[PDB]
Amino acid sequence: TYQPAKVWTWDKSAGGAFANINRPVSGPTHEKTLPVGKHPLQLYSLGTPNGQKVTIMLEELLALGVTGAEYDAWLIRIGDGDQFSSGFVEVNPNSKIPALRDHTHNPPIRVFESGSILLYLAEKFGYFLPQDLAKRTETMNWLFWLQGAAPFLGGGFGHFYHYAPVKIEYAINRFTMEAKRLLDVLDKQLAQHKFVAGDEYTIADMAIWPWFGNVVLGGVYDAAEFLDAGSYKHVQRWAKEVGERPAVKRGRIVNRTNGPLNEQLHERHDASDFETNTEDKRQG
Amino acid sequence: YQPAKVWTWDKSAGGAFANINRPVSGPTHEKTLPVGKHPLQLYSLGTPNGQKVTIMLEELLALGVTGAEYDAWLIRIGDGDQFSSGFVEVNPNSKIPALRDHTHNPPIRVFESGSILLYLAEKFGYFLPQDLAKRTETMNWLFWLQGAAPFLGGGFGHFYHYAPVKIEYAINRFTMEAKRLLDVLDKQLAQHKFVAGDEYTIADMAIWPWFGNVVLGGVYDAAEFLDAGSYKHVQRWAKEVGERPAVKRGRIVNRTNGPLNEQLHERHDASDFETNTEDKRQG
Ligand SMILES: N[C@@H](CCC(=O)N[C@@H](CS)C(=O)NCC(=O)O)C(=O)O
Ligand SMILES: N[C@@H](CCC(=O)N[C@@H](CS)C(=O)NCC(=O)O)C(=O)O
Ligand SMILES: N[C@H](CCC(=O)N[C@@H](CS)C(=O)NCC(=O)O)C(=O)O
Ligand SMILES: N[C@H](CCC(=O)N[C@@H](CS)C(=O)NCC(=O)O)C(=O)O
């Protein structure tokens, strides 16, 4: 019967999902400077649920004509360890996407953590975060909630249900029960409010949709049936409402490398890229 | 064992926190929350997440910010107090800490410890830099904490410490990550006195009760396992922050175990630290 050691040590031979990238130590593995484009915002990211939050926000800002939200979204393949380049570590020492630099300052200001990037963009431009203190505070409560909940959905439920090479009943049960509890909190909130934090769409919706909205629409971990996604009537209503917004349809495909080819735009350097550079146009 | 097509909730599970954990949210009983005389009403327990907030409130009072006066009411999460109707009304997620600011009508509810730290920093104007670069870097680390603690607590703490059955696969996954996060923090503190820069902020208050106390042996009985003495900069900073007068006080609010002089079950007036700690209630 297994007993932990007095002092944990790393077995590099264990293998398994993300074996090639996960380590007990942080920092750079190689020297590479990040590319920088002509736009004021430089984003270094991948179209996972956390990258999508940020590119949905950027697209929503552009739809309101916000010229300062123009951006270059450079692809960082986390499977290849691009997050451990010297250049990437300088923008985010935690080596996770998304990471952004705002080049309208000197020196440029780095922003890492998807939730921090959403708050930074909301404050910078003044949209998608209410002015009223009570409404702003509710919006922040739900944004934080997501930032504290996604780790359970991804690092817990998604890991054990989808990626782990061994199906562990105790861990699947613990993390599926919690993912359901979180969906239930979200469902009972959306029963009473059009959007997560109230009557208006905010950065809280943008943070939550790529995780909880996509999970119930079948888009993450092949888990909608296992999670009984159809039982969360109000999550479904809201996930379809937010998912149909034109800026969400564009934001959700930026830096995306899975799904239908016509729903992948591997980098974004101008608005016209959506017309000409999606992966369905690059098959020859 | 193979997962089902659709997960169903069995009982017969009696593992750690199995008696409070459910796949559904909402109240288990009806009870109103107590309300005291002070402007800020806190409903919490002195776990790492409660301590973030009581530290901030004590730091603000140390600066003479009288509007941070607070009632810190005890919520016993092991008794299901987080599932009363009154508690669900302040935080529909049923976790502590949760706070209401009764200087508004209706009072403004604030839930998630990181949301509370931000709300208080913005309300009073302390512990969140005004310079945009420094402000942004403080928020990066605060959000980093809020996204990292789930792995330290609901992963590492759960599988290493609380679960009586030690599941090697899970313990290796979450220990590795705990150490990676410690190393991030150590490499940052190698270059900076506080987590976000030169000055103490809400980011230190968020991170200390988790990563600071883990390295000092205060959480999960894990310092040896984690090789915590290897993170020299986390140790330096953890000791430096722990010496702060307001940290010494904040860390004991709503604590219900440990030495008697390190337990103040509720805080309802500043003199409670002199009169009403569990050691002083000894007759
Ligand atoms: N708390 C984070 C989590 C970010 C995150 O988990 N990014 C993942 C991809 S979605 C990643 O970069 N993983 C790289 C790795 O684990 O090495 C945030 O909200 O930004
Ligand atoms: N993301 C959270 C987590 C809060 C949390 O995990 N609270 C725990 C105590 S430290 C809790 O109330 N647990 C009660 C339960 O799980 O039923 C926050 O930062 O406030
Ligand atoms: N270090 C990895 C990389 C995979 C990954 O980073 N997953 C992301 C989603 S793409 C995640 O669970 N993020 C948690 C969060 O968003 O807080 C792992 O072993 O789980
Ligand atoms: N629902 C429980 C209760 C235990 C609990 O709430 N743990 C807190 C620490 S006291 C936690 O890990 N919080 C995670 C966070 O702060 O994000 C669990 O099964 O993990």
XYZ file of C-alpha atoms and ligand atoms in Angstrom:
647
model
C 0.000 0.000 0.000
C 1.516 3.266 -1.174
C 3.069 5.720 1.235
C 4.540 9.095 0.280
C 8.274 9.646 0.851
C 9.570 11.997 3.567
C 10.702 14.409 0.813
C 9.068 14.332 -2.594
C 11.328 13.741 -5.612
C 10.566 13.960 -9.308
C 10.333 10.725 -11.347
C 11.088 11.968 -14.886
C 10.300 8.499 -16.215
C 6.618 8.537 -15.097
C 5.350 9.954 -18.403
C 1.634 10.696 -18.921
C -0.262 13.716 -20.117
C 1.831 16.881 -20.412
C 4.891 14.852 -19.320
C 7.063 16.879 -21.720
C 6.133 20.197 -20.151
C 5.205 19.782 -16.486
C 8.065 20.312 -14.052
C 8.525 21.040 -10.352
C 10.655 24.037 -11.266
C 9.935 27.205 -13.212
C 11.905 29.430 -15.534
C 13.184 29.473 -19.074
C 14.317 26.352 -20.969
C 15.645 28.222 -24.076
C 16.471 31.685 -25.419
C 14.019 33.341 -27.788
C 12.800 36.900 -28.046
C 9.074 37.450 -28.553
C 7.842 38.925 -31.825
C 6.269 42.401 -31.696
C 3.866 43.760 -34.377
C 2.539 47.227 -35.234
C -0.511 47.234 -32.925
C -0.589 48.784 -29.498
C -1.527 45.515 -27.660
C 0.766 42.444 -28.053
C -0.854 39.205 -26.939
C 0.991 35.876 -26.584
C -1.561 33.182 -26.278
C -3.370 29.983 -27.355
C -7.109 29.618 -28.060
C -7.832 27.503 -24.983
C -10.672 28.744 -22.674
C -8.209 31.166 -21.058
C -6.950 32.690 -24.300
C -10.530 32.946 -25.632
C -11.572 35.194 -22.708
C -9.067 37.783 -23.788
C -9.610 37.640 -27.501
C -13.367 37.827 -27.012
C -12.822 41.011 -24.956
C -10.532 42.487 -27.654
C -13.092 41.683 -30.368
C -15.956 43.143 -28.277
C -13.915 46.355 -27.842
C -13.182 46.540 -31.569
C -16.899 46.119 -32.292
C -17.531 49.324 -30.301
C -14.909 51.038 -32.489
C -12.169 51.084 -29.845
C -9.062 51.766 -31.983
C -6.687 51.302 -29.042
C -7.791 47.644 -28.709
C -6.132 46.733 -32.057
C -3.872 43.819 -31.316
C -1.357 41.324 -32.489
C -2.145 37.836 -31.199
C 0.954 35.627 -31.528
C 0.563 31.868 -31.178
C 2.251 30.157 -28.194
C 2.085 26.351 -28.482
C 2.065 25.203 -24.890
C 2.487 21.564 -26.064
C 5.866 22.605 -27.559
C 7.057 24.526 -24.498
C 6.856 27.985 -26.131
C 5.767 29.218 -22.708
C 9.278 28.520 -21.388
C 11.223 30.732 -23.770
C 13.283 33.501 -22.167
C 11.035 36.039 -23.978
C 7.858 34.397 -22.729
C 9.121 34.163 -19.134
C 9.832 37.900 -19.197
C 6.119 38.660 -19.904
C 4.848 36.012 -17.511
C 7.214 34.357 -14.946
C 4.477 31.745 -14.276
C 4.841 30.478 -17.960
C 1.113 30.327 -18.724
C -0.928 31.819 -21.558
C -2.450 34.309 -21.988
C 0.115 37.073 -21.475
C -0.086 40.602 -22.881
C 2.089 43.677 -23.189
C 0.622 47.138 -23.645
C 3.150 48.967 -25.846
C 1.476 52.362 -25.406
C 3.665 52.800 -22.322
C 7.383 53.057 -21.945
C 8.492 50.671 -20.827
C 5.540 48.498 -21.987
C 3.271 47.162 -19.208
C 2.976 43.392 -18.868
C -0.279 41.822 -17.853
C -0.592 38.117 -17.058
C -3.457 35.954 -15.659
C -6.502 35.995 -17.944
C -8.580 37.679 -15.222
C -5.960 40.427 -14.777
C -5.916 41.036 -18.529
C -9.740 41.379 -18.611
C -9.722 43.858 -15.719
C -6.800 45.807 -17.276
C -8.627 46.097 -20.623
C -11.942 47.077 -18.957
C -10.228 49.812 -16.913
C -8.098 51.045 -19.833
C -10.995 51.623 -22.196
C -13.959 51.982 -19.855
C -16.250 49.287 -21.262
C -17.670 45.996 -19.950
C -17.238 46.864 -16.275
C -20.054 48.919 -14.706
C -19.390 52.322 -13.280
C -21.899 51.923 -10.401
C -20.034 50.617 -7.301
C -22.544 47.906 -6.420
C -22.798 46.597 -9.977
C -19.003 46.839 -10.481
C -18.435 44.910 -7.222
C -20.883 42.159 -8.237
C -19.137 41.937 -11.570
C -15.770 41.535 -9.768
C -17.237 38.915 -7.409
C -18.137 36.720 -10.454
C -14.852 37.403 -12.271
C -12.928 36.279 -9.199
C -15.274 33.354 -8.745
C -14.387 32.122 -12.209
C -10.673 32.603 -11.652
C -10.942 30.448 -8.446
C -13.339 27.882 -10.046
C -11.688 27.154 -13.448
C -8.771 25.453 -11.685
C -11.245 22.835 -10.408
C -12.886 22.480 -13.827
C -9.677 22.174 -15.744
C -6.915 21.065 -13.407
C -9.273 18.745 -11.536
C -12.235 17.578 -13.660
C -10.627 17.931 -17.039
C -7.363 16.376 -15.945
C -8.879 13.336 -14.262
C -11.782 12.742 -16.612
C -10.088 13.415 -19.918
C -6.307 13.486 -19.790
C -5.100 11.178 -16.992
C -3.819 7.857 -18.400
C -5.471 6.077 -15.429
C -9.140 6.534 -14.559
C -9.170 7.171 -10.803
C -12.693 6.825 -9.332
C -12.127 8.852 -6.170
C -10.602 11.815 -8.126
C -13.157 11.692 -10.984
C -15.969 11.621 -8.440
C -14.526 14.511 -6.370
C -13.893 16.778 -9.360
C -17.087 15.882 -11.256
C -19.186 16.592 -8.160
C -17.448 19.984 -7.833
C -17.781 20.847 -11.527
C -21.543 20.112 -11.151
C -21.815 22.205 -8.008
C -20.210 25.118 -9.873
C -22.528 24.649 -12.840
C -25.402 24.630 -10.373
C -24.279 27.924 -8.727
C -24.039 29.438 -12.266
C -27.434 27.993 -13.315
C -29.297 29.393 -10.222
C -27.674 32.804 -10.880
C -28.695 32.815 -14.565
C -32.233 31.792 -13.571
C -32.605 35.346 -12.158
C -30.302 37.444 -14.332
C -29.829 37.725 -18.112
C -26.029 37.867 -17.730
C -23.860 36.509 -14.932
C -23.567 39.661 -12.838
C -26.890 41.285 -13.710
C -28.777 42.804 -16.690
C -25.704 43.759 -18.763
C -22.890 41.773 -20.424
C -19.555 42.272 -18.702
C -16.032 40.880 -18.400
C -17.529 38.328 -15.972
C -19.485 36.760 -18.840
C -16.356 36.812 -20.950
C -14.361 35.017 -18.272
C -17.010 32.377 -17.598
C -18.304 31.567 -21.046
C -15.200 29.864 -22.458
C -15.202 27.503 -19.501
C -18.741 26.910 -18.237
C -20.549 28.006 -21.410
C -18.413 25.883 -23.671
C -18.551 22.849 -21.325
C -22.355 22.756 -21.500
C -22.280 23.296 -25.323
C -20.062 20.206 -25.705
C -16.869 22.096 -26.403
C -14.451 21.072 -23.621
C -13.351 17.632 -22.446
C -16.020 15.761 -24.435
C -17.911 16.016 -21.136
C -21.379 17.504 -21.759
C -23.142 14.187 -21.576
C -21.167 13.017 -18.539
C -21.868 16.303 -16.722
C -25.622 16.121 -17.590
C -25.159 19.494 -19.352
C -28.725 19.546 -20.592
C -30.005 19.805 -17.004
C -28.570 23.322 -16.593
C -31.365 25.079 -18.523
C -30.246 28.610 -17.665
C -26.547 28.001 -18.357
C -27.673 26.633 -21.750
C -29.834 29.668 -22.535
C -27.108 32.121 -21.628
C -24.294 30.048 -23.311
C -26.235 30.143 -26.598
C -27.018 33.875 -26.229
C -23.381 34.837 -25.569
C -22.040 32.280 -28.101
C -24.060 33.926 -30.902
C -22.550 37.381 -30.431
C -20.453 38.256 -33.510
C -17.451 39.326 -31.428
C -17.609 36.039 -29.478
C -17.702 34.080 -32.758
C -14.534 35.845 -33.869
C -12.803 35.964 -30.454
C -13.308 32.289 -29.816
C -11.224 31.183 -32.848
C -8.158 33.406 -32.406
C -4.960 31.324 -31.768
C -7.211 28.242 -31.853
C -5.586 25.020 -33.110
C -8.375 22.507 -32.589
C -11.966 22.151 -33.752
C -13.207 22.710 -37.305
C -10.612 24.249 -39.567
C -12.914 27.156 -40.383
C -13.039 27.902 -36.653
C -9.256 28.375 -36.326
C -7.376 31.616 -36.969
C -3.908 30.793 -35.749
C -2.695 34.405 -35.422
C -4.384 37.789 -35.708
C -2.512 40.810 -37.047
C -5.332 42.654 -38.786
C -9.160 42.458 -38.853
C -9.040 41.229 -42.431
C -7.314 38.023 -41.276
C -10.738 36.647 -40.456
C -11.686 36.948 -44.155
C -8.544 35.279 -45.547
C -6.331 33.434 -43.050
C -8.488 30.907 -41.200
C -7.028 27.406 -41.318
C -9.641 26.140 -43.815
C -7.961 28.527 -46.320
C -4.509 27.060 -45.710
C -4.930 23.483 -46.783
C -3.704 24.125 -50.415
C -13.892 0.810 -12.889
C -14.924 2.782 -15.946
C -16.689 6.138 -15.765
C -20.383 5.961 -16.574
C -21.849 7.711 -19.654
C -23.554 10.183 -17.188
C -22.237 10.763 -13.685
C -24.616 10.111 -10.812
C -24.322 10.998 -7.133
C -23.869 7.955 -4.970
C -23.295 8.225 -1.256
C -21.294 5.700 0.839
C -18.412 8.128 0.184
C -17.092 9.141 3.660
C -13.724 10.586 2.616
C -12.429 14.082 3.430
C -15.199 16.707 3.358
C -17.585 14.126 1.807
C -20.203 15.138 4.431
C -20.403 18.765 3.196
C -19.536 18.362 -0.492
C -22.463 18.083 -2.901
C -23.043 18.333 -6.713
C -25.764 20.916 -5.995
C -25.532 24.381 -4.439
C -28.072 26.365 -2.334
C -29.264 26.302 1.274
C -29.663 23.233 3.541
C -31.563 25.215 6.206
C -32.997 28.656 6.921
C -31.152 31.057 9.196
C -30.435 34.785 9.004
C -26.875 36.142 9.375
C -26.033 38.133 12.510
C -25.352 41.882 12.016
C -23.238 43.961 14.457
C -22.639 47.725 14.843
C -19.619 48.177 12.595
C -19.720 49.254 8.910
C -18.124 46.065 7.607
C -19.720 42.675 8.344
C -17.492 39.644 7.709
C -18.673 35.992 7.723
C -15.596 33.824 7.781
C -13.256 31.242 9.320
C -9.486 31.700 9.918
C -8.347 29.391 7.129
C -5.833 30.847 4.657
C -8.654 32.555 2.800
C -10.243 34.174 5.891
C -6.789 35.307 7.118
C -6.188 37.257 3.846
C -9.140 39.469 4.703
C -8.638 39.833 8.481
C -5.016 40.736 7.800
C -6.174 43.474 5.398
C -8.713 44.797 7.854
C -6.085 44.869 10.659
C -3.571 46.546 8.385
C -6.105 49.253 7.521
C -7.012 49.806 11.212
C -3.280 50.066 12.059
C -3.145 53.002 9.639
C -6.003 54.733 11.459
C -8.620 53.842 8.891
C -11.520 53.829 11.296
C -14.005 53.022 8.497
C -12.512 49.491 8.355
C -14.056 48.661 11.773
C -15.612 45.245 11.368
C -17.607 42.440 12.954
C -15.973 39.113 12.041
C -18.661 36.432 12.639
C -17.629 32.778 12.819
C -18.904 30.476 10.082
C -18.155 26.792 10.937
C -17.729 25.205 7.512
C -17.462 21.766 9.068
C -21.029 22.273 10.501
C -22.582 23.468 7.230
C -22.991 27.131 8.389
C -22.034 28.151 4.786
C -25.289 26.575 3.618
C -27.728 28.612 5.673
C -30.166 30.729 3.680
C -28.517 33.844 5.149
C -25.047 32.733 4.075
C -26.134 31.740 0.530
C -27.607 35.295 0.254
C -24.185 36.867 0.846
C -22.318 34.269 -1.290
C -24.311 31.936 -3.539
C -21.133 29.816 -3.883
C -21.259 28.988 -0.110
C -17.593 29.626 0.662
C -15.969 31.868 3.255
C -14.912 34.611 3.348
C -17.937 36.739 2.494
C -18.476 40.344 3.424
C -21.228 43.034 3.394
C -20.482 46.762 3.447
C -23.322 48.260 5.472
C -22.361 51.866 4.636
C -24.577 51.247 1.564
C -28.248 50.497 1.441
C -28.780 47.751 0.517
C -25.403 46.694 1.818
C -22.972 45.677 -0.971
C -22.049 42.007 -0.858
C -18.443 40.963 -1.637
C -17.495 37.323 -2.040
C -14.230 35.612 -3.097
C -11.330 36.606 -0.856
C -9.498 38.284 -3.787
C -12.637 40.359 -4.589
C -12.810 41.404 -0.933
C -9.124 42.445 -0.884
C -9.647 44.511 -4.052
C -12.885 46.088 -2.749
C -11.265 47.182 0.512
C -8.085 48.501 -1.261
C -10.233 50.604 -3.588
C -12.664 51.719 -0.901
C -9.983 53.117 1.444
C -7.135 53.766 -1.010
C -4.361 51.673 0.623
C -2.380 48.549 -0.370
C -3.043 48.814 -4.099
C -0.540 51.108 -5.892
C -1.824 54.139 -7.741
C 1.012 54.074 -10.381
C -0.491 52.152 -13.327
C 2.484 49.858 -13.878
C 2.782 48.950 -10.170
C -1.027 48.668 -9.823
C -1.124 46.281 -12.813
C 1.753 44.168 -11.518
C -0.030 43.938 -8.064
C -3.187 42.719 -9.782
C -1.199 40.170 -11.868
C 0.090 38.575 -8.625
C -3.260 38.833 -6.852
C -5.016 37.059 -9.755
C -2.072 34.581 -9.865
C -2.768 33.652 -6.236
C -6.488 33.216 -6.829
C -5.709 30.821 -9.692
C -2.899 28.976 -7.906
C -4.345 28.372 -4.407
C -6.932 25.879 -5.778
C -4.004 23.657 -6.767
C -2.280 24.093 -3.367
C -5.439 23.487 -1.373
C -7.997 21.521 -3.320
C -5.262 19.458 -4.966
C -2.124 19.172 -2.853
C -3.677 19.746 0.606
C -6.526 17.467 -0.219
C -4.602 14.469 -1.558
C -1.427 14.759 0.493
C -2.798 15.811 3.840
C -6.531 15.245 4.344
C -7.332 12.115 2.308
C -6.457 9.133 4.572
C -5.933 7.016 1.441
C -2.844 8.378 -0.290
C -3.302 8.266 -4.036
C 0.125 8.380 -5.598
C -0.899 9.634 -9.078
C -2.781 12.597 -7.589
C -0.182 13.336 -4.901
C 2.570 13.436 -7.626
C 0.500 15.707 -9.958
C -0.303 18.216 -7.252
C 3.014 18.142 -5.422
C 4.899 18.862 -8.618
C 2.619 21.831 -9.259
C 2.845 23.111 -5.666
C 6.627 23.136 -6.033
C 6.534 24.823 -9.418
C 4.370 27.562 -7.951
C 6.701 27.894 -4.946
C 9.616 28.253 -7.368
C 7.817 30.996 -9.330
C 7.245 32.826 -6.070
C 10.846 32.215 -4.892
C 12.355 33.526 -8.153
C 10.204 36.649 -7.894
C 11.077 37.296 -4.277
C 14.789 36.841 -5.145
C 14.521 40.186 -6.998
C 11.845 42.039 -4.983
C 11.237 42.697 -1.287
C 7.493 42.032 -1.638
C 5.707 39.939 -4.224
C 4.820 42.753 -6.606
C 7.719 45.133 -6.019
C 9.262 47.271 -3.314
C 6.139 47.740 -1.187
C 3.672 45.506 0.648
C 0.310 45.217 -1.123
C -2.899 43.158 -1.259
C -0.903 40.654 -3.356
C 1.320 39.796 -0.314
C -1.810 39.533 1.878
C -3.389 37.087 -0.574
C -0.233 34.952 -1.010
C 1.153 34.820 2.566
C -1.535 32.737 4.274
C -1.148 30.123 1.553
C 2.477 29.976 0.301
C 4.013 31.862 3.211
C 2.456 29.604 5.851
C 3.112 26.417 3.837
C 6.857 27.127 3.884
C 6.837 27.947 7.588
C 5.082 24.601 8.304
C 1.770 26.194 9.230
C -0.484 24.547 6.629
C -0.763 20.791 5.750
C 2.260 19.592 7.712
C 4.087 19.652 4.391
C 7.281 21.729 4.695
C 9.603 18.764 4.772
C 7.757 16.960 1.962
C 7.834 20.050 -0.243
C 11.526 20.773 0.563
C 10.347 24.158 1.756
C 13.789 25.092 3.090
C 14.976 25.193 -0.523
C 12.838 28.299 -1.259
C 15.108 30.718 0.615
C 13.436 33.869 -0.707
C 9.921 32.660 0.103
C 11.246 31.931 3.625
C 12.785 35.397 4.026
C 9.599 37.121 2.883
C 7.310 34.756 4.859
C 9.134 35.601 8.081
C 9.256 39.323 7.286
C 5.503 39.487 6.639
C 4.767 37.310 9.680
C 6.521 39.800 11.953
C 4.131 42.565 10.933
C 1.954 43.585 13.922
C -1.281 43.559 11.853
C -0.400 40.112 10.460
C 0.075 38.736 13.976
C -3.426 39.947 14.843
C -5.175 39.287 11.510
C -4.022 35.662 11.373
C -5.842 34.740 14.622
C -9.309 36.143 13.735
C -11.971 33.387 13.575
C -9.284 30.733 14.374
C -10.625 27.823 16.343
C -7.559 25.660 16.840
C -3.869 26.008 17.746
C -2.625 27.695 20.925
C -5.261 29.498 22.992
C -3.536 32.855 22.661
C -3.735 32.434 18.841
C -7.498 32.036 18.828
C -9.955 34.989 18.665
C -13.176 33.258 17.722
C -15.008 36.469 16.780
C -13.979 40.101 16.510
C -16.468 42.708 17.493
C -14.229 45.438 18.929
C -10.534 46.267 18.810
C -10.115 45.533 22.535
C -11.034 41.871 21.883
C -7.373 41.173 21.129
C -6.580 42.164 24.758
C -9.688 40.729 26.453
C -11.322 37.927 24.490
C -8.736 35.630 22.982
C -9.395 32.087 24.189
C -6.482 32.243 26.669
C -7.879 35.472 28.251
C -11.301 33.895 28.625
C -9.722 31.436 31.041
C -11.050 32.286 34.542
N -4.989 31.289 -13.827
C -4.636 31.289 -15.235
C -4.414 29.898 -15.860
C -3.744 30.073 -17.230
C -3.528 28.686 -17.854
O -3.920 27.578 -17.170
N -2.968 28.606 -19.071
C -2.675 27.238 -19.587
C -3.401 27.102 -20.903
S -5.187 27.427 -20.705
C -1.220 27.111 -19.881
O -0.579 28.169 -20.410
N -0.578 25.978 -19.578
C 0.866 25.886 -19.795
C 1.474 24.861 -18.884
O 0.765 24.320 -18.003
O 2.730 24.672 -19.009
C -5.123 32.406 -16.040
O -6.290 32.606 -15.750
O -4.528 32.981 -16.947
N -11.811 31.057 -4.423
C -12.104 31.228 -3.016
C -12.177 29.994 -2.148
C -12.765 30.098 -0.771
C -12.712 28.771 -0.053
O -12.070 27.701 -0.638
N -13.343 28.745 1.101
C -13.359 27.465 1.830
C -12.683 27.672 3.193
S -10.945 28.249 2.965
C -14.771 27.082 2.167
O -15.601 28.036 2.632
N -15.178 25.833 2.061
C -16.539 25.455 2.451
C -16.974 24.327 1.544
O -16.215 23.879 0.660
O -18.092 23.839 1.688
C -11.908 32.556 -2.301
O -10.744 32.984 -2.583
O -12.643 33.123 -1.447
N 0.164 21.999 -16.724
C -0.959 21.425 -17.463
C -1.411 22.115 -18.710
C -2.855 21.912 -19.127
C -3.501 23.207 -18.749
O -2.677 24.281 -18.521
N -4.800 23.295 -18.527
C -5.487 24.585 -18.395
C -6.616 24.701 -19.387
S -6.016 24.724 -21.090
C -6.133 24.735 -17.055
O -6.597 23.604 -16.428
N -6.224 25.940 -16.487
C -6.770 26.105 -15.143
C -7.310 27.502 -14.916
O -7.750 28.124 -15.916
O -7.321 28.002 -13.756
C -1.765 20.421 -16.711
O -1.007 19.475 -16.408
O -2.990 20.379 -16.418
N -15.100 21.539 -0.431
C -13.884 21.179 0.315
C -13.516 21.919 1.574
C -12.047 22.254 1.905
C -11.644 23.657 1.460
O -12.679 24.525 1.275
N -10.396 23.981 1.235
C -9.970 25.339 0.992
C -8.916 25.760 1.993
S -9.617 25.938 3.671
C -9.379 25.446 -0.360
O -8.572 24.426 -0.827
N -9.631 26.513 -1.066
C -9.092 26.636 -2.424
C -8.859 28.084 -2.818
O -8.580 28.959 -1.954
O -8.874 28.391 -4.029
C -12.815 20.418 -0.453
O -13.275 19.285 -0.652
O -11.620 20.759 -0.831
